[PDB]
Design an enzyme around this catalytic site. Structure first.
Site, PDB file in Angstrom:
ATOM      1  N   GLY A  29       0.872  -1.162   0.000  1.00  0.00           N
ATOM      2  CA  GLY A  29       0.000   0.000   0.000  1.00  0.00           C
ATOM      3  C   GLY A  29       0.912   1.214   0.000  1.00  0.00           C
ATOM      4  N   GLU A  50       0.298  -1.160  -4.902  1.00  0.00           N
ATOM      5  CA  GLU A  50      -0.941  -0.410  -4.657  1.00  0.00           C
ATOM      6  C   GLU A  50      -2.086  -0.800  -5.587  1.00  0.00           C
ATOM      7  OE1 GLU A  50      -2.021   1.770  -2.285  1.00  0.00           O
ATOM      8  OE2 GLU A  50      -3.879   1.543  -3.448  1.00  0.00           O
ATOM      9  N   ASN A  92       1.765   0.313   5.899  1.00  0.00           N
ATOM     10  CA  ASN A  92       0.800   0.992   6.756  1.00  0.00           C
ATOM     11  C   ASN A  92      -0.473   0.372   6.195  1.00  0.00           C
ATOM     12  OD1 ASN A  92      -0.529   2.983   8.407  1.00  0.00           O
ATOM     13  ND2 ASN A  92      -0.952   4.123   6.516  1.00  0.00           N
ATOM     14  N   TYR A  95      -7.026  -2.224   8.490  1.00  0.00           N
ATOM     15  CA  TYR A  95      -7.451  -3.219   9.460  1.00  0.00           C
ATOM     16  C   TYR A  95      -8.262  -4.361   8.848  1.00  0.00           C
ATOM     17  CZ  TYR A  95      -9.991  -5.368  13.367  1.00  0.00           C
ATOM     18  OH  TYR A  95     -10.545  -6.247  14.269  1.00  0.00           O
ATOM     19  N   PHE A 154      -3.453   9.617  12.192  1.00  0.00           N
ATOM     20  CA  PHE A 154      -4.206   9.159  11.026  1.00  0.00           C
ATOM     21  C   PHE A 154      -5.359  10.081  10.628  1.00  0.00           C
ATOM     22  CE2 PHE A 154      -2.630   5.273  13.119  1.00  0.00           C
ATOM     23  CZ  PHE A 154      -2.043   4.595  12.054  1.00  0.00           C
TER      24      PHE A 154
END
Length: 235
Positions: A29, A50, A92, A95, A154
C-alpha cells in the site's frame, strides 16, 4: 484510508524503522506516497504495491525526483514475491485485511524483516498464544511491538490507536514434514478440543513436561513442547 501525512509524525515513526541504504523494499500500500518518499531516500530500491490506480499516480508524482523505485498497480494478495533475493517489507495496512496481508507476506514471501503499522488490538493478538494466527506466525517469525501510533496521526481518525510492529524471519520451528500435523494441533489446541489430541494422561504428562502450570498463559516454547509431545505419542 487512514493516511499519515504529518512530516513530523512520519519522521518519528521512521526513527524506529531500521532499514538501510542497501535494502530492497516492498511497500504494502503506498497511500499518497508519504512513507514511499521516505523509503526511497533511506533504502536501495522500493517496490510499492498499490491496488488503487489514482494512488499509484499520486505516489508517483510525489516521488518525481527519485529513480530508485517503481509503483505496481497490483493486488498484494496475488502478488508473487522474489524467491532468490534478500528483501524487507514495510506497510501501513488497513485493518479489514490485516490478517490476509500478514499471512500473505509471512507464509508466501521470503522477506527477512517486515515492518507494519496495524491497530493496537490486532498487534496484541499476534502475541497471544491463545490464538491460532499467533501460533502459526511464531513458527516462522519473531514478533515485537516497537511503538504506539496515536490515532490522531491518522486521517480519517480511527477510533483506536495503532502499533508499529516488526516481524523477523528465523529458521522455521516446524519442519515442512509436520505442516498438516501442526495445523491440526494448533486448531484443536486453541479451540480447547483437548480430547481430540491428548488422552487425559498424555495431557497431564505433556503439561508437566512442558512446565505449564497455568493453561491460560503459556509461552510459545511451551506450546512447541506440547506439539513435540503430541508427535511422540502418535508414532
Amino acid at each position: 484510508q487512514n493516511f499519515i501525512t504529518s512530516k513530523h509524525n512520519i519522521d518519528k515513526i521512521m526513527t524506529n524503522i531500521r532499514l538501510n541504504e542497501h535494502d530492497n523494499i516492498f511497500e504494502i500500500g503506498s497511500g499518497k506516497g508519504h512513507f514511499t518518499l521516505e523509503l526511497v531516500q533511506r533504502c536501495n530500491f522500493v517496490t510499492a504495491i498499490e491496488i488503487d490506480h489514482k494512488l499509484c499516480k499520486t505516489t508517483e508524482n510525489k516521488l518525481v525526483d527519485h529513480d530508485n523505485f517503481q509503483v505496481l498497480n497490483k493486488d498484494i494478495l496475488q502478488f508473487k514475491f522474489p524467491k532468490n533475493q534478500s528483501y524487507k517489507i514495510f506497510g501501513n495496512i488497513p485493518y479489514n485485511i490485516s490478517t490476509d496481508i500478514i499471512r500473505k507476506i509471512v507464509f508466501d514471501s521470503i522477506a527477512d524483516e517486515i515492518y507494519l503499522i496495524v491497530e493496537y488490538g490486532f498487534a496484541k493478538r499476534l502475541l497471544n498464544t491463545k490464538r491460532s494466527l499467533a501460533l502459526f506466525l511464531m513458527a516462522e517469525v519473531d514478533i515485537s511491538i516497537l511503538s504506539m501510533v496515536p490515532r490522531e496521526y491518522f486521517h480519517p481518525k480511527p477510533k483506536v490507536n495503532s502499533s508499529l510492529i516488526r516481524l523477523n524471519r528465523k529458521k522455521s520451528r516446524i519442519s515442512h514434514k509436520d505442516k498438516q500435523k501442526y495445523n491440526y494441533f494448533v486448531m484443536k489446541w486453541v479451540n480447547k478440543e483437548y480430547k481430540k489430541i491428548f488422552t487425559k494422561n498424555q495431557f497431564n504428562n505433556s503439561l508437566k513436561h512442558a512446565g505449564i502450570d497455568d493453561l491460560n498463559n503459556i509461552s510459545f516454547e511451551q506450546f512447541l513442547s506440547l506439539f513435540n509431545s503430541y508427535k511422540l505419542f502418535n508414532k
